Amino acid sequence: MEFSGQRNASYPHCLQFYLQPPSENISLIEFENLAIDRVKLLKSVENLGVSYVKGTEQYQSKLESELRKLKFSYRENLEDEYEPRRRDHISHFILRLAYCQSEELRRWFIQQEMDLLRFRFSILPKDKIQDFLKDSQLQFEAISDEEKTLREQEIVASSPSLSGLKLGFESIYKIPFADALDLFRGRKVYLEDGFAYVPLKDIVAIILNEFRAKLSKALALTARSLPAVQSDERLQPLLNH
Amino acid sequence: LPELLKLYYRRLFPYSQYYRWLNYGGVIKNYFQHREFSFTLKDDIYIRYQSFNNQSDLEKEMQKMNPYKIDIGAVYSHRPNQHNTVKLGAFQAQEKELVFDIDMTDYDDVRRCCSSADICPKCWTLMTMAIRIIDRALKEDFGFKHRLWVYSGRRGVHCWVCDESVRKLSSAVRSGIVEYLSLVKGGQDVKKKVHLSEKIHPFIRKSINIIKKYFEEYALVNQDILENKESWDKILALVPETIHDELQQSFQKSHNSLQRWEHLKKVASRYQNNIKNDKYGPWLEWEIMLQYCFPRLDINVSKGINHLLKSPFSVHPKTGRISVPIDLQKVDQFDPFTVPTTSLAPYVKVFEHFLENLDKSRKG
């Protein structure tokens, strides 16, 4: 037998890249606290850094508690996490203007963002990787995967860092040496005829690099185009102090 | 010299091919007019920021000045000959071929038959290996298609890589390309210049494969790299002190560099198999071979977009030789002592073959 009988489209994944402007409304206290709580988070990431080494389980365990406490987006949930995702999106747009006040402050918050992104990419299950790589512009197509076992022999003979198990669990796909730039110029690993046998973390490095490029362009736009919006700026001193 | 240059720049310089090369079909607006050139004249009088609206301007200027040496620069935001008319800071370089510079004088710590700016048939085998290794890397590993190799006129060769994507490379990537192509590290006083990891990237593997075709004839026969204590001391500076006594004894017991190199490989193999935990890497043989045969470069030539490097079909003032192209199908058959000072046609044919490939790539 065959039977008969909205915000999902906004953020199909917890990951987001700020292409679309949220064309809606906000309260004063709302945008204020949405940004200010994230200022606390930015400091907290580096406080955790001075506590102990970056990205360990101690980092992971404490960091998710920060997110649950601070009500922003998560390892992706199936219930209404779209509200935290749009809060994250909106508050990100709000955060562009505070620490654009100095390039050192820009670089400071960018660095904790890269750390946070690296953590999130470290958490990812396989299904997340499979659907986000296809649903994003971050396609990076694989070629002739059956050859990977000839490189299970060759890489293992040819690399100090990589191993046969990493061929499968850091699942190997073929893309150019230039997408593994630090690995070719350091000559660290098996690459051949200009092609690299690549796990996800190299594409994460590319994601971080293009994110930095696009964000830097946005910060330049923040420095230049913003004055029509600047009818109120009372929070800026409290934010830069 | 000037009368020979007058005749050369009138009758022999390949202007149509040169303009066809640096204009790249005229696809990009005023690209050749934005190209920089630099002229060096009698008594080393100098003129930077030359540029030409068409082939006729190029021909007129080279016949007018009759330069001893010509260098090619970047494509700029404005015509370089009109840079005095441009706003402060607005005159800037934008594009440049990926250019490599290889000189025989760079090998004076490993070659023995010659030194300084002089060359001979014994040491020029290094340039055969250098051309082959760099060109093979640029072909296979980097994937760059249009690569023009040119003899400088006395002591070395230059490679001009001319793809559009290559012309648009940034300074950082250019430096990375050189660093990747530079296994030989350090300055003139550094004793050991090549170091290898316990397991090796396939890029390096190919260099040893090329070197093996020439290492006997060059290093063991013509240079005789282990002839005597003075020669083998420089190689012993590359190896563990634990095996210096054994290697010295084996070298003394061996009659020539061939047997001495075989004994060096045997001792190195036994040491590699015996001791794991030493500071020296296991691929000692490859390190010695690479230090004595691998390409050598100046990163400043390649990284700088606005840098000036010697023009193809320019001339050398003391040898009188033309800066001719080198046929990649016949690298081993090139000879710098046969270069012209008509007989220039084969080298122009190499240039025209390169440009026919360039044009066909553009059209297809």
Swiss-Prot record, chain A:
Outcome when changing residue 97 to A: Decreases primase affinity for POLA1 by 40-fold
Disulfide-bonded cysteines: none
Free-text comment on this protein's domains from its UniProt entry: The RNA:DNA duplex-binding domain interacts with the template phosphates at positions -2, -1, 1, and 2 positioning its bases -1, 1, and 2 for duplex formation. Interacts only with the beta- and gamma-phosphates of triphosphate moiety of initiating NTP of the primer.
Regions annotated as coiled coil: none
Name by which UniProt lists this protein: DNA primase large subunit
Function: Regulatory subunit of the DNA primase complex and component of the DNA polymerase alpha complex (also known as the alpha DNA polymerase-primase complex) which play an essential role in the initiation of DNA synthesis. During the S phase of the cell cycle, the DNA polymerase alpha complex (composed of a catalytic subunit POLA1, an accessory subunit POLA2 and two primase subunits, the catalytic subunit PRIM1 and the regulatory subunit PRIM2) is recruited to DNA at the replicative forks via direct interactions with MCM10 and WDHD1.
Residues represented out of the complete protein: 1 to 252 of 509
Family the entry assigns: Belongs to the eukaryotic-type primase large subunit family.
Subunit structure: Heterodimer of a catalytic subunit PRIM1 and a regulatory subunit PRIM2, also known as the DNA primase complex. Interacts via (C-terminus) with PRIM1. Component of the alpha DNA polymerase complex (also known as the alpha DNA polymerase-primase complex) consisting of four subunits: the catalytic subunit POLA1, the regulatory subunit POLA2, and the primase complex subunits PRIM1 and PRIM2 respectively. Within the complex, POLA1 directly interacts with PRIM2.
Domain of life: Eukaryota
From Swiss-Prot, chain B:
Regulation: The presence of the regulatory subunit PRIM2/p58 accelerates the kinetics of initiation and primer extension. Inhibited by arabinose nucleoside derivatives such as fludarabine and vidarabine.
One Pfam family named in its UniProt record: DNA_primase_S
Impact upon substituting residue 101 to A: Loss of primase activity
Protein name, entry field: DNA primase small subunit
Keyword NADP attributed: no
Residue positions binding Zn(2+): 113-114, 120, 123
Motif (Zinc knuckle motif): 113-123
Annotated residues for binding of Mg(2+) 2: 101, 103, 298
Chain sites annotated for binding Mg(2+) 1: 101, 103
Role this protein plays: Catalytic subunit of the DNA primase complex and component of the DNA polymerase alpha complex (also known as the alpha DNA polymerase-primase complex - primosome/replisome) which play an essential role in the initiation of DNA synthesis. During the S phase of the cell cycle, the DNA polymerase alpha complex (composed of a catalytic subunit POLA1, an accessory subunit POLA2 and two primase subunits, the catalytic subunit PRIM1 and the regulatory subunit PRIM2) is recruited to DNA at the replicative forks via direct interactions with MCM10 and WDHD1.
Chain positions recorded as Mn(2+) 2 binding sites: 101, 103, 298
Cofactor requirements of the protein: Mg(2+); Mn(2+)
GO MF assignments: DNA-directed RNA polymerase activity; magnesium ion binding; ribonucleotide binding; zinc ion binding
UniProt cross-references to SUPFAM superfamilies, sorted A to Z: Prim-pol domain
Family, per entry: Belongs to the eukaryotic-type primase small subunit family.
Effect of residue 298 to A: Loss of primase activity
Taxonomic source organism: Homo sapiens
Additional record remark: The bound zinc ion is not a cofactor. It is bound to a zinc knuckle motif that may be involved in sequence recognition and the binding of ssDNA.
Known outcome of mutating residue 108 to A: Slightly decreases primase activity
